[PDB]
Amino acid sequence: IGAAKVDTILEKDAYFPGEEVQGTVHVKGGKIAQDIRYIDLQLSTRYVIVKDDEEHRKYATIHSFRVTGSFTIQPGEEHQFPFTFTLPLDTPITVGKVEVAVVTDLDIQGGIDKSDHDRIFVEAHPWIENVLEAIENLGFRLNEADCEQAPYFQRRLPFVQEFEFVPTSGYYRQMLDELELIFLLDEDGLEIIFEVDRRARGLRGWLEEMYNDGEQLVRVRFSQSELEDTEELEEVLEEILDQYA
Amino acid sequence: IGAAKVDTILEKDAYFPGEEVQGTVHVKGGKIAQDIRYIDLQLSTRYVIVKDDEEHRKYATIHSFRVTGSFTIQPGEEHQFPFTFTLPLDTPITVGKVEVAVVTDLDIQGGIDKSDHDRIFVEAHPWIENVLEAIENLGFRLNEADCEQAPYFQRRLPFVQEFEFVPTSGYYRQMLDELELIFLLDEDGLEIIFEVDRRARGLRGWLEEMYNDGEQLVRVRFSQSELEDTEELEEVLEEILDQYAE
Ligand code: NA
Ligand code: NA
């Protein structure tokens, strides 16, 4: 009926990509002593694969590291392993249906391993939120965001986070049925992938077969200066969107 | 030795990224029947990690997949497993010190596993070769190329291929001791990372601490159209480099 218990506590509720997560894994031994092989932490989320017009959600590990190595835990004994790790820059934003979880794996040799799970909210990176606010000012509204299968981009992760906006102005209603953005965040800036009418076209996921028929894709890099510069950001974004008229 | 044998044969020895590699894994049973758990192929290379000014080279897996699952092979028996896979777009170019190998892993249950090794030459993709020709035309000469540890860029692979050029003209000698380019190739175009005087500054690998003090980095995306018109390419590259004349 279980002996040793594990509990992870992060110091904050909210982080954005690039920020340092700090916390502590608390372990308390049970009635009789057990041999602990290691304590691992993982950040994970899920992403969608659509097959034959039905959704499959698949777990994916964003980051993983070892909190501690082997030690023996004796009766009732209390141990604290403090940790820190950096949130990867491709960590998805917690909005819509996207959740990001911190999973603690405490491995017990012979043994039934113990685990913990802590949701973390991942906020939009400042540059990303600048882009988003700029986009909504132009006459758009954020409708959906979800992690979608993206083998086509051959990224570190198997998925990308797809932001789907709906036009709130007559002009953009006329231009498109909806707008799609992918953010690829790096240390020096941000790359944006633009697409339109993906829902209209009944497209899900990002696959080779969508660009084989000579469809092509708008892909634009912004540097830090541009992203922190608000005004010209909205107008360059307007310029990019105008190519869809 | 009358033991179980594996031999992998590719149809070509040379490919560029995005191209399909085809071949066959040939297996021959040894004197005694064995249970084979699987046959895997691995595409791999090595990259440099510098610590305290010493080079350590570390093995890295570019791609991996299962050619076949479990079967029993009888003595002297021959099996052929044909295969195909696509060379990932971040596969490094085989030039300088870079090697790319296809490794066959035949796992035998209890058992001494068998292996094969086939080098492949990975050619510069045409857009990259356009950039390379463009850079040398401006007055550079390609000096070194290697795979370098690069956690800073957080790519799919732990390394990037770093191309180092040496200035061959008075103008560019006056500008720099050397130029460094990183190509990040994708389906719709190509991204170039520019840096100068990394060797002069004794920098190896791409790390957070190199850009924390307010060093900055030139990072520019080119599309397919731009990459395939060579003139406009050299003048764009000339313009990008002009920011270093300062
Ligand atoms: Na917890
Ligand atoms: Na071979």
Coordinates of C-alpha atoms and ligand atoms in Angstrom, one line a residue:
Chain A
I1 CA 0.0 0.0 0.0
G2 CA 3.1 2.2 -0.6
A3 CA 6.0 3.4 1.6
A4 CA 8.2 6.1 0.3
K5 CA 6.5 9.3 -0.9
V6 CA 7.7 12.0 -3.3
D7 CA 6.6 15.6 -3.7
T8 CA 8.0 18.3 -6.0
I9 CA 7.5 22.1 -5.2
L10 CA 8.5 24.8 -7.6
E11 CA 9.1 28.3 -6.2
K12 CA 6.8 30.1 -8.7
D13 CA 3.5 29.4 -10.4
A14 CA 4.5 31.0 -13.7
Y15 CA 7.5 31.1 -16.0
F16 CA 8.3 32.0 -19.6
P17 CA 10.8 30.4 -22.0
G18 CA 14.4 31.1 -21.0
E19 CA 13.6 31.7 -17.3
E20 CA 15.1 29.6 -14.6
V21 CA 12.9 27.2 -12.8
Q22 CA 14.0 26.4 -9.3
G23 CA 12.4 24.1 -6.8
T24 CA 12.8 21.2 -4.4
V25 CA 12.1 17.5 -4.6
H26 CA 10.9 16.3 -1.1
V27 CA 11.3 12.6 -0.4
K28 CA 10.0 10.8 2.7
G29 CA 10.8 7.2 3.4
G30 CA 8.2 4.7 4.3
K31 CA 8.0 2.0 7.0
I32 CA 11.1 0.1 5.8
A33 CA 14.1 1.4 4.0
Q34 CA 14.3 1.4 0.2
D35 CA 17.1 1.8 -2.3
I36 CA 16.6 4.8 -4.5
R37 CA 18.4 4.6 -7.8
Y38 CA 17.8 8.2 -8.9
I39 CA 15.5 11.2 -9.1
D40 CA 14.6 12.5 -12.6
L41 CA 12.6 15.5 -13.6
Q42 CA 10.8 16.0 -16.9
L43 CA 8.8 18.8 -18.6
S44 CA 6.2 17.5 -20.9
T45 CA 3.2 18.5 -23.0
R46 CA 1.0 16.9 -25.6
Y47 CA 0.6 17.3 -29.3
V48 CA -2.1 16.4 -31.9
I49 CA -1.8 14.0 -34.8
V50 CA -4.8 13.8 -37.0
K51 CA -5.3 10.6 -38.8
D52 CA -8.4 9.9 -41.0
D53 CA -10.0 13.1 -39.6
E54 CA -9.7 12.0 -36.0
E55 CA -7.4 13.5 -33.3
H56 CA -4.7 11.5 -31.4
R57 CA -2.9 13.3 -28.6
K58 CA 0.7 12.2 -28.0
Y59 CA 2.9 13.0 -25.0
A60 CA 6.2 14.6 -25.7
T61 CA 9.1 15.4 -23.4
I62 CA 10.4 19.0 -23.7
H63 CA 13.2 18.7 -21.2
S64 CA 14.7 16.1 -18.9
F65 CA 17.4 16.0 -16.3
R66 CA 18.5 14.1 -13.2
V67 CA 17.9 15.7 -9.9
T68 CA 19.9 13.3 -7.9
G69 CA 21.8 10.0 -8.0
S70 CA 21.4 6.8 -6.0
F71 CA 21.0 6.9 -2.2
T72 CA 19.2 4.8 0.4
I73 CA 16.2 6.1 2.2
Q74 CA 15.6 4.8 5.7
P75 CA 12.4 4.7 7.8
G76 CA 10.4 8.0 8.0
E77 CA 13.6 9.8 6.8
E78 CA 13.2 13.2 5.1
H79 CA 15.4 14.3 2.2
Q80 CA 15.4 17.5 0.1
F81 CA 16.9 17.7 -3.3
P82 CA 16.9 21.3 -4.6
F83 CA 17.2 21.8 -8.3
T84 CA 17.3 24.4 -11.0
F85 CA 17.0 24.1 -14.8
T86 CA 16.3 26.5 -17.6
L87 CA 13.0 26.5 -19.4
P88 CA 13.8 25.6 -23.1
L89 CA 12.9 28.4 -25.6
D90 CA 10.6 26.1 -27.6
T91 CA 8.5 25.3 -24.5
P92 CA 4.9 25.9 -25.5
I93 CA 2.7 28.7 -24.0
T94 CA 0.0 27.6 -21.6
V95 CA -3.2 28.7 -23.4
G96 CA -6.2 27.0 -25.0
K97 CA -5.8 23.2 -24.5
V98 CA -2.0 23.3 -24.1
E99 CA -0.8 22.2 -20.6
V100 CA 2.8 21.9 -19.6
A101 CA 3.6 19.4 -16.8
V102 CA 6.6 18.9 -14.5
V103 CA 6.9 15.1 -13.9
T104 CA 9.0 13.8 -11.1
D105 CA 10.3 10.2 -11.4
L106 CA 11.8 8.7 -8.3
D107 CA 13.2 5.4 -9.3
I108 CA 13.2 2.7 -6.6
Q109 CA 15.1 -0.5 -7.2
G110 CA 12.9 -3.4 -6.3
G111 CA 10.7 -1.1 -5.6
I112 CA 7.6 0.2 -7.3
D113 CA 8.8 3.6 -8.6
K114 CA 7.2 6.8 -7.3
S115 CA 6.1 9.8 -9.3
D116 CA 4.8 13.4 -9.0
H117 CA 3.1 15.8 -11.4
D118 CA 3.0 19.6 -11.2
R119 CA 1.3 21.8 -13.8
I120 CA 3.3 24.9 -14.7
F121 CA 1.9 27.9 -16.6
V122 CA 4.1 29.0 -19.3
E123 CA 3.6 32.7 -20.2
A124 CA 4.2 34.2 -23.6
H125 CA 7.8 35.5 -24.0
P126 CA 7.8 39.3 -24.1
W127 CA 8.7 39.4 -27.8
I128 CA 6.0 36.9 -28.6
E129 CA 3.4 38.8 -26.7
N130 CA 4.5 41.9 -28.6
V131 CA 3.8 40.1 -31.8
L132 CA 0.5 38.9 -30.5
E133 CA -0.7 42.3 -29.4
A134 CA 0.4 43.8 -32.7
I135 CA -1.6 41.1 -34.6
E136 CA -4.8 41.7 -32.6
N137 CA -4.5 45.5 -33.0
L138 CA -4.6 45.0 -36.8
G139 CA -8.1 43.6 -36.6
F140 CA -7.5 40.0 -35.4
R141 CA -8.5 37.9 -32.4
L142 CA -6.7 34.8 -31.0
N143 CA -9.0 31.9 -31.5
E144 CA -7.0 28.7 -30.8
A145 CA -3.5 27.7 -29.9
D146 CA -2.5 24.1 -29.8
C147 CA 0.5 21.9 -30.3
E148 CA 0.4 20.2 -33.7
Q149 CA 2.5 17.5 -35.3
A150 CA 5.2 19.1 -37.5
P151 CA 7.6 16.7 -39.1
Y152 CA 8.0 19.1 -42.0
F153 CA 10.1 21.6 -40.0
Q154 CA 12.5 19.0 -38.6
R155 CA 12.7 20.9 -35.3
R156 CA 14.1 19.8 -31.9
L157 CA 10.6 18.9 -30.9
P158 CA 8.1 16.8 -33.1
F159 CA 5.4 19.5 -32.7
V160 CA 5.0 23.3 -33.1
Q161 CA 2.6 25.5 -31.3
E162 CA 0.1 26.9 -33.8
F163 CA -1.7 30.2 -33.1
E164 CA -4.9 30.5 -35.0
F165 CA -6.4 34.0 -35.2
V166 CA -9.8 35.1 -36.6
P167 CA -10.3 38.4 -38.4
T168 CA -12.3 41.0 -36.3
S169 CA -12.3 43.7 -39.0
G170 CA -14.1 43.8 -42.3
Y171 CA -10.9 44.2 -44.3
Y172 CA -9.2 41.0 -43.0
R173 CA -12.6 39.2 -43.0
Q174 CA -12.5 39.9 -46.7
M175 CA -8.8 38.9 -47.0
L176 CA -8.9 35.5 -45.3
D177 CA -11.1 33.1 -43.3
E178 CA -8.3 32.8 -40.6
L179 CA -4.6 33.5 -39.9
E180 CA -2.0 31.0 -38.6
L181 CA 1.3 31.8 -36.8
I182 CA 4.2 29.6 -35.6
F183 CA 6.8 31.2 -33.3
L184 CA 10.3 29.8 -33.3
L185 CA 12.1 31.6 -30.4
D186 CA 15.9 31.7 -30.2
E187 CA 18.3 33.8 -28.1
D188 CA 18.8 36.6 -30.7
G189 CA 15.3 36.9 -32.0
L190 CA 12.2 35.2 -33.3
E191 CA 11.2 33.5 -36.5
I192 CA 7.5 33.6 -37.6
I193 CA 5.9 31.2 -40.0
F194 CA 2.7 32.6 -41.6
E195 CA -0.1 30.7 -43.2
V196 CA -3.8 31.4 -44.1
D197 CA -7.0 29.5 -44.4
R198 CA -5.6 26.3 -42.9
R199 CA -8.9 25.6 -41.2
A200 CA -10.8 26.5 -44.3
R201 CA -8.6 24.0 -46.2
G202 CA -9.2 21.4 -43.5
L203 CA -5.4 21.2 -42.9
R204 CA -4.0 19.8 -39.7
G205 CA -0.4 19.3 -38.7
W206 CA 2.6 20.3 -40.7
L207 CA 3.6 17.8 -43.3
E208 CA 5.6 17.6 -46.6
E209 CA 2.4 16.8 -48.6
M210 CA 1.1 20.3 -48.0
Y211 CA 4.1 21.9 -49.7
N212 CA 4.7 19.3 -52.5
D213 CA 2.1 20.7 -55.0
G214 CA 4.1 23.9 -55.1
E215 CA 2.3 25.6 -52.3
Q216 CA 4.9 27.7 -50.5
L217 CA 5.3 29.2 -47.1
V218 CA 6.0 32.7 -45.7
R219 CA 8.8 32.5 -43.2
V220 CA 10.2 35.6 -41.7
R221 CA 12.9 36.3 -39.1
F222 CA 12.7 39.3 -36.7
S223 CA 15.7 40.3 -34.5
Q224 CA 15.5 41.6 -31.0
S225 CA 15.6 45.3 -31.9
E226 CA 12.6 44.9 -34.3
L227 CA 10.6 42.9 -31.7
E228 CA 11.1 45.4 -29.0
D229 CA 10.2 48.2 -31.4
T230 CA 6.3 48.2 -31.2
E231 CA 5.2 50.6 -33.9
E232 CA 7.2 49.4 -36.8
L233 CA 6.5 45.9 -35.6
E234 CA 2.8 46.3 -36.3
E235 CA 3.4 48.0 -39.6
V236 CA 5.9 45.4 -40.9
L237 CA 3.4 42.7 -39.8
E238 CA 0.7 44.6 -41.7
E239 CA 3.0 44.6 -44.8
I240 CA 3.6 40.9 -44.5
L241 CA -0.2 40.2 -44.2
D242 CA -1.0 42.4 -47.2
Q243 CA 0.6 39.9 -49.6
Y244 CA -2.5 37.8 -49.1
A245 CA -4.8 40.3 -50.9
Chain B
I1 CA 35.5 -17.4 -37.8
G2 CA 32.4 -19.3 -38.9
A3 CA 30.1 -16.7 -37.1
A4 CA 27.0 -14.7 -38.2
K5 CA 27.9 -12.0 -40.6
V6 CA 26.3 -8.6 -41.6
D7 CA 27.2 -6.5 -44.7
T8 CA 25.4 -3.3 -45.6
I9 CA 25.6 -2.0 -49.2
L10 CA 24.3 1.4 -50.2
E11 CA 23.5 2.1 -53.8
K12 CA 25.6 5.3 -53.7
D13 CA 28.5 6.6 -51.6
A14 CA 27.5 10.3 -52.1
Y15 CA 24.4 12.2 -51.2
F16 CA 23.3 15.7 -50.3
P17 CA 20.8 16.6 -47.6
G18 CA 17.2 15.8 -48.4
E19 CA 18.1 13.0 -50.8
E20 CA 16.9 9.5 -50.2
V21 CA 19.5 6.9 -49.2
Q22 CA 18.7 3.4 -50.5
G23 CA 20.5 0.1 -49.8
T24 CA 20.3 -3.4 -48.6
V25 CA 21.4 -5.1 -45.4
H26 CA 22.8 -8.6 -46.1
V27 CA 22.9 -11.1 -43.3
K28 CA 24.5 -14.6 -43.4
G29 CA 24.0 -17.1 -40.6
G30 CA 27.0 -18.5 -38.8
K31 CA 27.6 -22.2 -38.0
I32 CA 24.9 -22.2 -35.3
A33 CA 21.3 -20.9 -35.6
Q34 CA 20.8 -17.6 -33.9
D35 CA 17.9 -15.4 -32.8
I36 CA 18.2 -11.9 -34.1
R37 CA 16.3 -9.2 -32.1
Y38 CA 16.5 -6.4 -34.7
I39 CA 18.5 -4.7 -37.3
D40 CA 19.0 -0.9 -36.9
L41 CA 20.7 1.7 -39.1
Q42 CA 22.3 4.8 -37.7
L43 CA 23.5 8.0 -39.4
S44 CA 26.2 9.6 -37.3
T45 CA 29.0 12.1 -37.1
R46 CA 31.3 13.6 -34.5
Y47 CA 31.6 17.1 -33.1
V48 CA 34.2 19.0 -31.2
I49 CA 33.8 20.1 -27.6
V50 CA 36.6 22.3 -26.2
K51 CA 37.4 22.4 -22.5
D52 CA 40.3 24.3 -21.0
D53 CA 41.8 24.5 -24.6
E54 CA 41.7 20.8 -25.3
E55 CA 39.6 19.2 -28.1
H56 CA 37.4 16.3 -27.2
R57 CA 35.4 14.7 -30.1
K58 CA 32.0 13.2 -29.3
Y59 CA 29.9 10.8 -31.3
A60 CA 26.4 12.0 -32.3
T61 CA 23.4 10.3 -33.9
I62 CA 21.9 12.2 -36.8
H63 CA 19.2 9.7 -37.6
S64 CA 18.1 6.3 -36.5
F65 CA 15.5 3.7 -37.6
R66 CA 14.7 0.0 -37.5
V67 CA 15.5 -2.0 -40.6
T68 CA 13.8 -5.1 -39.3
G69 CA 12.5 -6.8 -36.2
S70 CA 13.2 -10.2 -34.7
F71 CA 13.8 -13.4 -36.7
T72 CA 15.8 -16.6 -36.4
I73 CA 18.6 -17.2 -38.9
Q74 CA 19.7 -20.8 -39.6
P75 CA 23.3 -21.8 -40.2
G76 CA 24.9 -20.2 -43.3
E77 CA 21.5 -18.8 -44.3
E78 CA 21.3 -15.5 -46.3
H79 CA 18.7 -12.8 -45.8
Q80 CA 18.4 -9.5 -47.7
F81 CA 16.7 -6.5 -46.1
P82 CA 16.3 -3.6 -48.5
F83 CA 15.8 -0.1 -47.0
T84 CA 15.3 3.6 -47.7
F85 CA 15.6 6.7 -45.5
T86 CA 15.8 10.4 -46.1
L87 CA 19.0 12.3 -45.2
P88 CA 17.9 14.9 -42.6
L89 CA 18.5 18.5 -43.8
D90 CA 20.8 19.2 -40.8
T91 CA 23.2 16.4 -41.9
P92 CA 26.7 18.1 -42.1
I93 CA 28.6 18.4 -45.3
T94 CA 31.6 16.1 -45.6
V95 CA 34.5 18.5 -46.0
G96 CA 37.4 19.3 -43.7
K97 CA 37.5 17.1 -40.7
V98 CA 33.8 16.1 -40.8
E99 CA 32.9 12.4 -41.2
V100 CA 29.4 11.0 -41.7
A101 CA 28.9 7.3 -41.3
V102 CA 26.0 4.8 -41.8
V103 CA 26.3 2.3 -39.0
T104 CA 24.5 -1.1 -39.0
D105 CA 23.6 -2.6 -35.7
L106 CA 22.5 -6.2 -35.8
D107 CA 21.5 -7.2 -32.3
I108 CA 21.7 -10.9 -31.5
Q109 CA 20.1 -12.3 -28.4
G110 CA 22.8 -13.8 -26.2
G111 CA 24.7 -13.4 -28.6
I112 CA 27.5 -11.1 -29.5
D113 CA 26.1 -8.3 -31.5
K114 CA 27.4 -7.6 -35.1
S115 CA 28.0 -4.4 -36.8
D116 CA 28.9 -2.7 -40.1
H117 CA 30.3 0.8 -41.0
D118 CA 29.8 2.6 -44.3
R119 CA 31.1 6.1 -44.7
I120 CA 29.1 8.5 -46.9
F121 CA 30.2 11.7 -48.5
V122 CA 27.6 14.4 -47.9
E123 CA 27.8 17.1 -50.5
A124 CA 26.9 20.7 -50.2
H125 CA 23.3 21.4 -51.1
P126 CA 23.2 23.7 -54.2
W127 CA 21.9 26.7 -52.2
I128 CA 24.8 26.3 -49.8
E129 CA 27.2 25.9 -52.7
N130 CA 25.8 29.1 -54.1
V131 CA 26.6 30.9 -50.8
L132 CA 30.1 29.4 -50.7
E133 CA 30.9 30.4 -54.2
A134 CA 29.4 33.9 -53.5
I135 CA 31.6 34.3 -50.4
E136 CA 34.8 33.3 -52.2
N137 CA 34.0 35.6 -55.1
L138 CA 34.0 38.5 -52.7
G139 CA 37.6 37.7 -51.7
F140 CA 37.4 34.8 -49.2
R141 CA 38.8 31.3 -49.3
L142 CA 37.3 28.4 -47.4
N143 CA 39.7 27.4 -44.7
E144 CA 38.1 25.1 -42.2
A145 CA 34.8 23.3 -41.6
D146 CA 33.9 21.3 -38.6
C147 CA 31.0 20.3 -36.4
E148 CA 31.1 22.3 -33.2
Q149 CA 29.3 22.0 -29.9
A150 CA 26.4 24.5 -30.0
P151 CA 23.9 24.4 -27.1
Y152 CA 23.3 28.1 -27.6
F153 CA 21.2 27.6 -30.7
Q154 CA 19.1 24.8 -29.2
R155 CA 18.8 22.9 -32.5
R156 CA 17.6 19.3 -33.1
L157 CA 21.3 18.3 -33.0
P158 CA 23.8 19.3 -30.3
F159 CA 26.2 20.7 -32.9
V160 CA 26.3 23.0 -35.9
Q161 CA 28.6 22.9 -38.9
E162 CA 30.9 25.9 -38.7
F163 CA 32.5 27.1 -42.0
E164 CA 35.6 29.3 -41.5
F165 CA 36.9 31.5 -44.3
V166 CA 40.1 33.5 -44.6
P167 CA 40.2 36.9 -46.3
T168 CA 42.0 36.8 -49.6
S169 CA 41.7 40.5 -50.6
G170 CA 43.2 43.7 -49.1
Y171 CA 39.8 45.0 -48.3
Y172 CA 38.7 41.9 -46.4
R173 CA 42.1 41.5 -44.7
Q174 CA 41.6 45.0 -43.4
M175 CA 38.1 44.0 -42.2
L176 CA 38.8 40.8 -40.4
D177 CA 41.2 37.9 -39.7
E178 CA 38.5 35.4 -40.6
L179 CA 34.8 34.9 -41.3
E180 CA 32.5 32.2 -39.8
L181 CA 29.2 31.0 -41.3
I182 CA 26.6 28.6 -40.1
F183 CA 24.0 27.2 -42.5
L184 CA 20.7 26.1 -41.2
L185 CA 19.0 24.4 -44.1
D186 CA 15.2 23.8 -44.3
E187 CA 12.7 23.0 -47.0
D188 CA 11.8 26.6 -48.0
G189 CA 15.1 28.3 -47.7
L190 CA 18.2 28.7 -45.7
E191 CA 19.4 30.7 -42.6
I192 CA 22.9 32.0 -42.3
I193 CA 24.6 32.9 -39.1
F194 CA 27.6 35.3 -39.5
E195 CA 30.4 35.9 -37.1
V196 CA 33.9 37.3 -37.4
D197 CA 37.3 36.8 -35.7
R198 CA 36.3 33.8 -33.6
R199 CA 39.7 32.3 -34.0
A200 CA 41.4 35.6 -33.3
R201 CA 39.3 35.8 -30.1
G202 CA 40.0 32.1 -29.3
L203 CA 36.3 31.2 -29.3
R204 CA 35.3 27.5 -29.9
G205 CA 31.7 26.2 -29.9
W206 CA 28.6 28.3 -29.5
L207 CA 27.6 29.1 -25.9
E208 CA 25.5 31.4 -23.8
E209 CA 28.5 33.0 -22.1
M210 CA 29.8 34.2 -25.5
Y211 CA 26.7 36.4 -26.1
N212 CA 25.8 37.4 -22.5
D213 CA 28.1 40.5 -22.4
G214 CA 26.3 42.2 -25.3
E215 CA 28.2 40.6 -28.1
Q216 CA 25.8 40.4 -31.0
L217 CA 25.3 38.0 -33.8
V218 CA 24.2 38.5 -37.4
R219 CA 21.4 36.1 -38.3
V220 CA 19.7 36.3 -41.7
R221 CA 17.1 34.2 -43.5
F222 CA 17.3 33.7 -47.3
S223 CA 14.5 32.1 -49.4
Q224 CA 14.8 29.7 -52.3
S225 CA 14.4 32.5 -54.9
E226 CA 17.2 34.6 -53.4
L227 CA 19.5 31.6 -53.1
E228 CA 19.1 30.6 -56.7
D229 CA 19.9 34.0 -58.2
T230 CA 23.6 34.2 -57.7
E231 CA 24.3 37.8 -58.5
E232 CA 21.8 39.3 -56.2
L233 CA 23.2 36.8 -53.6
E234 CA 26.7 38.1 -53.7
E235 CA 25.6 41.7 -53.4
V236 CA 23.3 40.9 -50.5
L237 CA 26.3 39.1 -48.8
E238 CA 28.6 42.1 -49.6
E239 CA 26.0 44.3 -47.8
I240 CA 25.7 42.0 -44.8
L241 CA 29.5 41.9 -44.4
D242 CA 29.7 45.7 -44.7
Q243 CA 28.6 46.1 -41.2
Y244 CA 32.0 44.7 -40.1
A245 CA 34.1 47.3 -42.0
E246 CA 33.6 49.6 -39.0
Ligands
NA1 NA 4.1 18.6 -6.3
NA2 NA 29.2 -2.0 -45.5

